[PDB]
Amino acid sequence: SKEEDEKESQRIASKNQLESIAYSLKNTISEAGDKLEQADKDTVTKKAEETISWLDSNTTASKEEFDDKLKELQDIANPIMSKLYQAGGAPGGAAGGAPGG
């Protein structure tokens, strides 16, 4: 039937893009050396690698599940990306706006 083909091709796209994003998270940390702390940096990249391992282990999951992984990856990465950006990643003017303290 067409149904399986449709779903499979989407699962492929989902795997591919999710995989790419995991590498993108680590790629971002590659310039984040002094900009991020070792703990949050390890947290995102470790999770990214877990994400890569998850894809290989759960290739048998549907694209909804790959989306789910993408979402939870993005959720945890979001604040850490944000702290990266508001330092020297997001355009502020001089530098990233410090929260004060």
Curated annotation (Swiss-Prot):
It is found in: Cytoplasm; Secreted, Cell wall. Present with 269000 molecules/cell in log phase SD medium. Belongs to the heat shock protein 70 family. It comes from the Eukaryota. The modification Phosphoserine is found at residues 30, 82. This is Heat shock protein SSA1. Binds human HTN3/histatin-5, a peptide from saliva, and mediates its fungicidal activity. Interacts with polyadenylate-binding protein PAB1 and Hsp70 chaperone SSA1 on translating ribosomes. Interacts with NAP1. There is a cross-link at residue 35 (Glycyl lysine isopeptide (Lys-Gly) (interchain with G-Cter in ubiquitin)). Residues 89-101 have a biased composition (Gly residues). May play a role in the transport of polypeptides both across the mitochondrial membranes and into the endoplasmic reticulum. A functional difference between SSA1 and SSA2 proteins is expected. SSA1 can participate in the ATP-dependent disassembly of clathrin-coated vesicles.
